Amino acid sequence: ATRDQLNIIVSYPPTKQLTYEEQDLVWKFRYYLTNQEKALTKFLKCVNWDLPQEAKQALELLGKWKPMDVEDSLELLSSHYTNPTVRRYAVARLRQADDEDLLMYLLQLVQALKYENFDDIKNGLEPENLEQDLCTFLISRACKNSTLANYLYWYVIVECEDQDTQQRDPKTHEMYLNVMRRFSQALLKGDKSVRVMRSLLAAQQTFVDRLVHLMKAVQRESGNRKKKNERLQALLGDNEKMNLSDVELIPLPLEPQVKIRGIIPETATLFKSALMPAQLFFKTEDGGKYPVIFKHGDDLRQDQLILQIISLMDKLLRKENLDLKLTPYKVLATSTKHGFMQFIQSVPVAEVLDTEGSIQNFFRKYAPSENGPNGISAEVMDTYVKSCAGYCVITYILGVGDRHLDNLLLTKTGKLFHIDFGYILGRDPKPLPPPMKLNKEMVEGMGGTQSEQYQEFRKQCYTAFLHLRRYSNLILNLFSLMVDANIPDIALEPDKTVKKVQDKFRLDLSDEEAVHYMQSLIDESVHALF
Numbered sequence: 001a002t003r004d005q006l007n008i009i010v011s012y013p014p015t016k017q018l019t020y021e022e023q024d025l026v027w028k029f030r031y032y033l034t035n036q037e038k039a040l041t042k043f044l045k046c047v048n049w050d051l052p053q054e055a056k057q058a059l060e061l062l063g064k065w066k067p068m069d070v071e072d073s074l075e076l077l078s079s080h081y082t083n084p085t086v087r088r089y090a091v092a093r094l095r096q097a098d099d100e101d102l103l104m105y106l107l108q109l110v111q112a113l114k115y116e117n118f119d120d121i122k123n124g125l126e127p128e129n130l131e132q133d134l135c136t137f138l139i140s141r142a143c144k145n146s147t148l149a150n151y152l153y154w155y156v157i158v159e160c161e162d163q164d165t166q167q168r169d170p171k172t173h174e175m176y177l178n179v180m181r182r183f184s185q186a187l188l189k190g191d192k193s194v195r196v197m198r199s200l201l202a203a204q205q206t207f208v209d210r211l212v213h214l215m216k217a218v219q220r221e222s223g224n225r226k227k228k229n230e231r232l233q234a235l236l237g238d239n240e241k242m243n244l245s246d247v248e249l250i251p252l253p254l255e256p257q258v259k260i261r262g263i264i265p266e267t268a269t270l271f272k273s274a275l276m277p278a279q280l281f282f283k284t285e286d287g288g289k290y291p292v293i294f295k296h297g298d299d300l301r302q303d304q305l306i307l308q309i310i311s312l313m314d315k316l317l318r319k320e321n322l323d324l325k326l327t328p329y330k331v332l333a334t335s336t337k338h339g340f341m342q343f344i345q346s347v348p349v350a351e352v353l354d355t356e357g358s359i360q361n362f363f364r365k366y367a368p369s370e371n372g373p374n375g376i377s378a379e380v381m382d383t384y385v386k387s388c389a390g391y392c393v394i395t396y397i398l399g400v401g402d403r404h405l406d407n408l409l410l411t412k413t414g415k416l417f418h419i420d421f422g423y424i425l426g427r428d429p430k431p432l433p434p435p436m437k438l439n440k441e442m443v444e445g446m447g448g449t450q451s452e453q454y455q456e457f458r459k460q461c462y463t464a465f466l467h468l469r470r471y472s473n474l475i476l477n478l479f480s481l482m483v484d485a486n487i488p489d490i491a492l493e494p495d496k497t498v499k500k501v502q503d504k505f506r507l508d509l510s511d512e513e514a515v516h517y518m519q520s521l522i523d524e525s526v527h528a529l530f
C-alpha cells in the first residue's frame with residue numbers, strides 16, 4: 001500500500017514534479033530509504049533548503065545515504081538545486097565516472113555552469129570530498145585528458161561569444177569568460193604536458209580564424225560556383241597568406257584525436273546551398289584524409305546537441321550489445337556563427353530516387369547478391385534494416401520534424417541516417433505531423449510490409465525502444481541541463497522541453513505494453529502511407 005506508493009515515487013522520472021502529498025510522504029520515510037540510491041534524489045527534492053535547520057538534517061541523511069549513480073547525480077547540477085553541499089556532492093559523484101562517460105556529458109555540464117556560484121568561479125582567479133565545484137572539476141579533469149580539454153575549450157568559447165547571452169544575461173556571459181580565464185590559468189600553471197595543451201588550443205583557434213577569413217574571401221569572387229571553387233582552392237594553396245595547407249600537426253577541433261597537417265587545396269569545393277558551406281579534406285598526420293563540412297553564417301548548436309545525444313544513444317545501444325549501424329557524425333560549433341561537421345560519404349534518398357528510382361535498385365546496383373534478399377547483399381540489407389529501426393526510434397524520441405528525402409541520407413553499405421536537425425522536440429513546418437517518421441521509400445527499401453525485413457525492422461524498433469527507456473533517467477537528466485541553453489527549439493518552450501522527451505518514453509507503460517504501443521505507432525504510420 002503506502003510502500004507501494006513510495007516505490008512509485010522513487011520510480012518517477014528525475015524531472016517529474018512530486019505533489020505536496022508525495023513530498024511530505026517521502027520526508028516521513030526518510031530513514032527507511034537511506035539504502036535505496038535511486039531514492040536519494042527524490043528526498044533531496046522534498047527538502048526546504050531555505051530553512052537552516054531542515055537543510056542541516058537533510059545533509060546528514062546525504063552522508064548516510066547509499067551513494068547515487070553518476071547518471072542520477074546529473075540531476076543535482078540542474079537549476080533546481082542551489083544548496084552548495086548538494087551541488088558539491090553531485091560533483092563528487094561525477095568524479096567516479098571515467099573520462100569516456102564524462103565526455104558524453106560535457107556539453108550539458110558546460111551549460112550547468114550557469115547554475116554554479118559565479119563569485120566562486122571569479123574568486124578562483126589569481127590576482128565524499130566536496131572541495132571542488134563544477135568549474136574546478138571540469139578544469140581538473142581537462143588538464144589530464146587532451147580530448148576533454150579540446151571540447152571544454154570550444155564548448156566554453158562558444159558560450160563566451162554568444163551575443164544573445166552577452167546582451168540578455170551579462171552576468172552569465174562574464175561567468176563563462178571567467179571559466180575560460182580559469183582554464184587558461186590552470187593550463188599555464190601545469191606540467192610541461194599541460195602547458196603545451198594551451199598553445200595547441202591557441203593554434204586551433206588561429207586556424208579556425210583563418211578559415212573563417214578564407215570563407216569570406218572566397219565570397220569576394222562574384223562568379224559562379226566554379227569560379228568560387230577556383231578562388232577557394234587557390235587561397236588554400238597560398239599557405240604563406242592563408243596558412244591553412246601546412247600547419248604544425250594540431251588536433252582537429254571536430255575530432256581532437258585526429259592530428260592534421262592542413263587542408264588539401266585542390267579538392268576543396270563549395271556546396272550548392274544558400275550559405276555555400278565548404279567541403280574540406282584535412283591532411284592527417286599519417287598521410288590520411290579527414291573530410292569535413294565547414295559552415296559559416298549558421299548556428300550549429302542545435303545540430304551539435306542532437307548529434308551528441310544520438311552519439312550517446314548509440315553508445316547506450318552498443319553497451320546493451322545492440323549495434324544498429326547508426327551514423328552519429330561529429331558536429332562542433334566553433335562559434336555561434338560557424339562550425340565543423342564530419343562529412344559522411346553518402347547520397348540523399350531524394351537523389352537516389354531521381355537517379356535509380358528506388359533504394360532497392362540502388363542497393364542492387366552497388367551491392368548485388370544472387371541469393372541475397374531481392375538480389376541485394378544480405379549484409380547491406382541487414383545494415384539498412386537496423387539503421388532504419390534505430391533512426392526511426394531515435395527521431396521519434398527527439399521529436400525531429402521537417403523530414404524529407406533531402407535530409408535522409410544513404411550509404412552504399414546500407415547505412416541510412418538523418419541530417420539537418422533544424423526542427424526538433426515536436427516542431428515541424430507543417431501541422432499534424434506524423435508521430436513516427438517512416439516514409440514509403442523506407443518501407444519499399446526493405447521489401448515492403450510483406451517482407452520479413454519489415455518484421456525484423458519492427459523487432460529492432462521494439463528492442464531499441466525498450467533499451468533507451470531503461471536510460472530515460474540519464475537522457476532526461478541531460479535534457480534538463482539544457483533547458484536554459486541558447487538552442488532555438490528548446491528556447492521556444494523551455495518549461496515543456498523535458499516533458500516532451502519524457503512523454504516519448506511512455507514510462508507509464510510496462511515493457512510488454514510499450515512493445516504494443518510501438519507496434520501501433522509503426523503500423524499506423526505505415527497505414528498512413530498506404
Ligand SMILES: c1ccc2sc(-c3cnn4cccnc34)nc2c1
Nearest residue numbers: 329341342343344345346347348419
Ligand atoms: C548532396 C547534397 C547535400 C549533401 S549534405 C551531405 C552530407 C554528407 N555527410 N554529412 C554530414 C552532415 C550533413 N550533411 C552531410 N551529402 C550531400 C549530398
Ligand SMILES: [Cl-]
Nearest residue numbers: 019020021022
Ligand atoms: Cl497535493
Ligand SMILES: [Cl-]
Nearest residue numbers: 024027048054
Ligand atoms: Cl518537512
Ligand SMILES: [Cl-]
Nearest residue numbers: 116117120133
Ligand atoms: Cl558552485
Ligand SMILES: [Cl-]
Nearest residue numbers: 146149197200
Ligand atoms: Cl589539447
Ligand SMILES: [Cl-]
Nearest residue numbers: 169170171172
Ligand atoms: Cl544572470
Ligand SMILES: [Cl-]
Nearest residue numbers: 199200203248
Ligand atoms: Cl604549437
Ligand SMILES: [Cl-]
Nearest residue numbers: 215275276296
Ligand atoms: Cl560562406
Ligand SMILES: [Cl-]
Nearest residue numbers: 269270271279
Ligand atoms: Cl560537395
Ligand SMILES: [Cl-]
Nearest residue numbers: 225272273276
Ligand atoms: Cl550557389
Ligand SMILES: [Cl-]
Nearest residue numbers: 307308330331
Ligand atoms: Cl558531435
Ligand SMILES: [Cl-]
Nearest residue numbers: 346347348351
Ligand atoms: Cl551525392
Ligand SMILES: [Cl-]
Nearest residue numbers: 299302422488
Ligand atoms: Cl538552427
Ligand SMILES: [Cl-]
Nearest residue numbers: 426427428430
Ligand atoms: Cl508544429
Ligand SMILES: [K+]
Nearest residue numbers: 326327328329
Ligand atoms: K560515424
Ligand SMILES: [K+]
Nearest residue numbers: 350353354405
Ligand atoms: K524526389
